[model samples]
Target: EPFKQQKVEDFYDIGEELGSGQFAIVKKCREKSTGLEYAAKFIKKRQSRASRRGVSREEIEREVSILRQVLHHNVITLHDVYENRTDVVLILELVSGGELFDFLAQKESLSEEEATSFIKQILDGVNYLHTKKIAHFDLKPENIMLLDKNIPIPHIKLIDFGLAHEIEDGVEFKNIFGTPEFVAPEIVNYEPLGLEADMWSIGVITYILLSGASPFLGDTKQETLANITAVSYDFDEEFFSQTSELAKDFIRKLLVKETRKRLTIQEALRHPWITPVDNQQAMVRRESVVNLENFRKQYVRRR
Candidate 1:
């Protein structure tokens, strides 16, 4: 739980920026000792106690506390931690493949098999977290990273644990924090939350991955929350005309309003959609990636 007393520069040679957020920016870095490349995420400390905005110290600590404990192929690694007067530097695995949907949007072809391959990675990461009782409260398109896009199936890594938490037994943890369209009904309704919320997000991600349509997205944020609580989405004829039955069934089990009834991470991994009888027949390439491109543009435009 202790940060290195020295500065990050003394340990790693910081280079170009990799990605960023409101209060943090990650850059390409290499360890001075072994010359191993990594990403240094510089999280700006709050300027003053009275200031309303900046990465909270507590949030950063929690992210480090949780990330330090999780190690999996599908989950990003926390190589080291360092702190300075105005910021905290988190040394992380340098994931270069890019966002999951954005990468797929530019793909020449896509199919159910290809789609589930990505989802399977996500599930495996979440499955690992579930075993540790760590819930990544924020699970969306941006956080899903591909290690390398040049390969047939790039190694997927679930990044960003700023909103993660330890869901201890009988802890009764509940908090309304995450992207609007992806939060579970329990999250939107302010009910007791657990690992189920993450599963709900996986369901939404799967839905969008297959069809390129935002099921619970609404005209406004409030409307979106309403749609989520009402369980108002359906397999629209236009978007789902070519989607397989197992895919829809798989999503249906996870997106349910009742957390008790929703599919657990283990159950989801074992689902027929993820473990289809015939690989080639099930994952046959779909016709186009146009809808996904349109979805990506529109989805980000709302922000």
Candidate 2:
């Protein structure tokens, strides 16, 4: 495995900042030679006398190595890496379409057919990662991007490998990382976590896409954690009354409290929900967008 060790300035001309966080900032840039647009993520190198406060260089390397190994249409492409004494810059594929949340916000909620299409693509991406012994610990709407905003059903690209990790067969991890609402029970209980943990997140995502409500989100972080731990959620009539039985059945299989009984990506893809069903019942419009908007406000307040 080889990586480019070049100066960021030599290849890219930096532009306006796309986004920023505590550890890194993504900027729009153009390749000097090809003039192709890219998202340059500049992560500050950690430095401390004890070296115990921030992300380690080894961890960064692991993320880069995993990115290089995985090359899929749904996965975000890592074009190159450049480093200096202070920062490590990752040149990534620039996805013009905004986050999945924005897309859903405009539509209020997707139809059964639309939701199934998106879920199948997401499962395809997850299946590929599983085959490579990789698990995207974070599988939420914020980390997924659409390729084009104008299209009704835009292609998705799974982004943010910062929390991704590799696992060997039969081996489970005890490290706790991921959003509380999307976290699996094994992680909440500090048990060994495997690929099944990711399946749990997918279940959460599916629930959100269909209803635009946080199934486990509570008033506080502790409450939310408790809900996830207890697997306490109801298919409320307000949002789910019109949703088909097959769709609910699919979610039920994935949201199982027992990981062993949870639906795998293969099984989910082949499920009755994913395949076209001849249910002509008109899906009643639900207040998904309104509920999601309220949820977002609550989410911000909680933070």
Candidate 3:
């Protein structure tokens, strides 16, 4: 019963609850130390234990390690992390525009220009993650947030790295994780999969952006997994009627059944949908895909 309130006002002025889940609750607050506003994320080990698979300290550590190492304009920044006897607190940058999931549920879906810009930003953030050999196993509209003052301008950031993991060089991982509707076929079968799986989730995201719903989902999780494993979803004219041909083409390349056949992060960016309009010329673009090849060559050194 005490967990329901969760109000602490001594050290900082905790405002309204952002949201609550089985494991944690986020509150909008201001740090007393610097008078700066931040979203204080509180993760309790005991509360986390109440969930299906109880959370571990190691999981929090992995999240901290990954967030601290990577810094990008499109990635949600983790300001700081602290821990007490019962809870681990993470100070996070509050993206004022709120969650993309709620925004999508509104009567207004997305304007043509707004959707494209948002997709480009998503690709850029994923590009950065792949450059660091990290696969955001769960990429969805729900995990994305708008960062700017203007509503619906597509100024966004990627958050929730809890399901994220490092895919080492020449090493293959076979973990069956992420939401089934957005999960890749290779991932469902526990086959050797890498960064390409993330792209597959992004493909589902693209479909949702246009159709305002999921492409391969079924009535139940098992049914959805079956659909995903069959890889039976089609990209017909009606499914892609709202979006441009190039955009649908881009998704086709990324969501291939064969993980190896799928477009790598670097290649996906070069696709017409994600490439800058005046890419090769003026070079000043609002939401352009980050170059993954150069980034990997400089950082991860993938052969």
Candidate 4:
């Protein structure tokens, strides 16, 4: 079992806080015996009831259980879990490279070949989750993190399974849970959510990576929801002039209004955009720097 009974203080020297969430506070820690670094997530046993519905004790346990079962390079690795009467601590892999959002912002735009590499890793992780009958309802840039910053092609590790849920084969979930920008139309409309919803979110991520624009975001939350419900977005020529038609086609298939018509994980993996680019022309550099600047302006306005 991944869960351990040892007292956290006895085994590790707690360091600075990594990040804080509704019920958990992640801290950098070093194993006392081995001096190995880890990210220790300390989740309070008592949390606000409103936050609990979205991320309950049962859900936290479920996340731990799911992490224990998955063993993939693209997904986050769980070392062990420590518990007390007041808190439950999770010892996780120390990913010092930071969030994928920051990584993309720094790069401005990635070449098609480079973008393909990152997306492939993400799809690989998602495909594995689907095979295990788990759907990560929340798949945004923030949840995807880098393993190290020094590498040219940083390895991605998908984290935060707080919204992840196990599904029976062919079963659909009706719960509406996700970040507004990356959320699928089905989720916004309160329709049945299945594996395809994740594909839609990935499509949004791909779009953002290629152009650095929030396709469905609007001036207001209501407008944003409306845009998502309508699947309203476009490949602006200003940003996508150099992007290949095949890449556009990939996004089109995934961002379809109908979930049944959306590209499956297997199909997406085989798509021309994700596959090896034989002709260098297919891997054109995009004008993502300008687009990213515009996106930042819009983000500031919204805030």
Candidate 5:
């Protein structure tokens, strides 16, 4: 309750607002106590209660609990949680770079290798989440953030866990929630599901990443939903023509209609497109110092 009345200057020096939605305003803030930078998501209870666009406290608590359950390098860390009588505060990892959707629009398209590399990293994060029984109902380009590295690789953190829920016995809650483009067919029908629904979202993500267009999109929103429900879509050969078969194979395995038919993350990891993590130590170095130096120059330098 104290946090609601606490001013923005109490713990953090407020900077320009970074993002906002119906219920919360996210600002760039640095903790005065620790000097650590954070994205301070401040939400007012009254605004959240009235806004259909926002998540409720129950969802927020579930999100925090899910993040606490799973910790991985690829998933964004939940730094802190605080609250006031009127508001809630979520301190999250600050992704300096903006949303992936913006990047995709700018690039227009990504090469198969470029796309697959990001997809593999995404898989790494989602698979880790699935291992913990936490499904990211919302997986869209907007929710995935790119880290501000020199090359700007997609950091691929699953945010907005407001819709996330823990399932037991593979039971389904029968409530449809998630970005429109990423929702699986089973979810639209209110059928029971498990972790595979998340996989479906990844499938859509993969298609957009490589093709620069949605495979299931139609002229109208209703049509798009119809296409998703029917699972009737086609991939362009032009897109695949220049691309490797391994990439197409990857999409086929995940994007199919039948949930049972979809490729599990384990199967996806084993796919050839994703080569096993290189074991540089296992590779023999050249015996000669000159040759070893050359090998190191060529190989180890990249690593």
Candidate 6:
């Protein structure tokens, strides 16, 4: 029902390319009616199963369903969808500014309170997802983007839901993929997982953003993944000295090995750590600026 029979060129003026993936490429476009801006993402349909270059119709529908199904301030927007014989095009909202880490690292200073503000944005989006039993399998820092950095608290946009999946109420589901840094114990061990698995990734994300260090990062990929399953991580005093006890406790609750013990998204939103603080603390910005810069230099270059 979402896709129109008319081609994309009938309604929009497509411009230069923005980004591209295996079978998909995004281009800037303007709606002819209102001159509104959007990214026209065109995906090629696989003509047959034997062909490997294009996407399967099933995969395309799943992504389109997820896009049309969700609407939230923190989540991206999908306005129009079109399909011709060989291609599917999606008109999507565009978010400016680079990765969350890159944006924050360029700041003059940071505070535990300020960090909390951004983290809250992420939780709000995921909280909405959890409410619907949807799990965003990929939630890494790179996928988190900032909209209009000029604003004091730049709007957070959680981009990319290609790997997202909705859980069934009574059925057990299991899936495995190769991302290790922000992965949970259940994912690393290939065990059955649910919404709580997302909380574990949030725990690691919060830990790194606050301290500019990875909780389970090791010399080797195998070691790093093993560390996650083993639950081998600690808050080193040097990186966490300025961080508050309340904040650490929040991360601790989310990082537990037992999935049942991990903090639910609602509990995380209710945690005392999320309560807004006054402007007085802004005077003393969190001193992790250097650490953040170094952290990005070490990791972003490769990721």
Best model per lDDT = 1
lDDT string, candidate 2, 80-152, tens digits: 8888768888899998798766776676545566656677888888889999988889888888788899986
The model with the greater TM-score, 4 or 5, is 4
Q: How many times do residue backbones clash in model 3?
A: 0
Q: Please, what are the lDDT tens digits per residue for candidate 6 over residues 41-85?
A: 888888886897788788888887888778999877788789997
Report the Cα lDDT for candidate 6.
Answer: 0.79
Q: What is the overall TM-score of model 6 with all chains considered together? A: 0.89
Score every model by TM-score: 0.91, 0.89, 0.80, 0.88, 0.81, 0.89
lDDT of 5 by residue, 217-255 (tens): 787889988999888868666443454555667677888
RMSD of 2: 3.3
lDDT tens readout by residue for model 3, 1-303: 111222345566778788766677788888786898889887765454445533687777888888887799898988867676467777788877765544444423344445566677888988999999888887876688887645636467998888888888787678878676788888889688788888898888776665544668878888888888777666655444444556557777877878678888888778666664564421322222322222223222212
Root-mean-square deviation per candidate: 2.8, 3.3, 9.6, 3.1, 9.0, 3.0
Model 3 residue 197 lDDT score:
87
**Candidate 5, number of clashes:** 2
Query: Which number leads on TM-score?
Result: 1
Query: Each candidate: what lDDT?
Result: 0.82, 0.79, 0.70, 0.79, 0.68, 0.79
In order of TM-score, best first, we have: 1, 6, 2, 4, 5, 3
Better of 3 and 6 by TM-score: 6
| True lDDT of residue 273, candidate 4 | 69
Q: Which stretches of candidate 6 lie over 4 Å from their true place?
A: 276-303
Q: For residues 80-198, what per-residue lDDT tens digits would candidate 1 score against the true structure?
A: 88998788988888999878877787775566666777788888888999999899989999899889988877888989898899888877987778798888989987689898899
Residue 77 in candidate 2 has what lDDT? 85
Compared with the true structure, model 2 gives a TM-score of: 0.89
**Candidate 1 stretches greater than 4 Å from native:** 277-303
lDDT string for model 4 (56-151, tens) is 567679888888888889999888789865788889998889877667667655556666778899999999999997888888888889999878
Deviation (Å) of 180 in candidate 1:
1.2
